Amino acid sequence: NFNFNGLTGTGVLTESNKKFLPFQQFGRDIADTTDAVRDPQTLEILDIT
Amino acid sequence: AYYVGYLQPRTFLLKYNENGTITDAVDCALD
């Protein structure tokens, strides 16, 4: 049960193969859900499944 | 020899690629 800056939700988290732009935070899908965040104190990027 | 133009409200279509960078777009109300 994760929490990132107030974004709740469930699911599993893994490392990101996806390269990331140094101004965004959020990966959103077609289906209007969050698949990709960055830790707000660590520049690693995680994939949400 | 600088330029200048003005932005105005437009509906646009944006093609994010594999990397997540825009590569091409279409101005929906042009033609």
């Binding site: 732009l21 965004q24 935070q25 959103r28 | 330029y3 646009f12 994010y16």
Partner: peptide, 23 residues
Amino acid sequence: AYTNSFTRGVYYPDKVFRSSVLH
């Protein structure tokens, strides 16, 4: 004086990542 604004008047409109989709 005038020139043709070809296509480089475009930018990311928001801070939300997307990949491989026309949005």
